[PDB]
């Protein structure tokens, strides 16, 4: 039907929007320490301690698969990004800072992302 050409024309355009959001939010991690998921080979009890991993590369995969329904959905896949590292690392670590710093600095560019989705519709 027309309706749901119309819904998929939607969830299309909102792809787009979040791929521009995506690409602003790993330029603020210059380091690449969430580009891609905690190898297990090398951290092998990381699944002990988180329970939902994610990363950019995983983001990425998920978003062109037009997977994200709404903005909630992208911005929960980006917090568990932020707080599994800063709960498996420690404070006085580069791991640590840098989901730190990526909080902040994306806090300002998804704060802009809800007024362009909200407004857009
Ligand atoms: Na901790």
Redesign the pocket.
């Known amino acids: 039907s027309m309706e749901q050409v119309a819904m998929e024309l939607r969830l299309t355009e909102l792809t787009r929007l979040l791929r521009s959001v995506l690409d602003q939010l790993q330029d603020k991690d210059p380091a690449r320490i969430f580009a891609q998921p905690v190898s297990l080979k090398e951290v092998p009890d990381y699944l002990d301690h988180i329970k939902h991993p994610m990363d950019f590369a995983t983001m990425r995969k998920r978003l062109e698969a037009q997977g994200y329904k709404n903005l909630h959905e992208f911005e929960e896949d980006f917090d568990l990004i932020i707080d599994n590292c ?6 006085d670590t580069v791991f640590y800072r840098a989901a730190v710093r990526l909080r902040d600095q994306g806090g300002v560019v998804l704060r802009q992302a809800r007024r362009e989705v909200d407004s857009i519709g």
């Open positions: 800063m709960k498996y690392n420690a404070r």
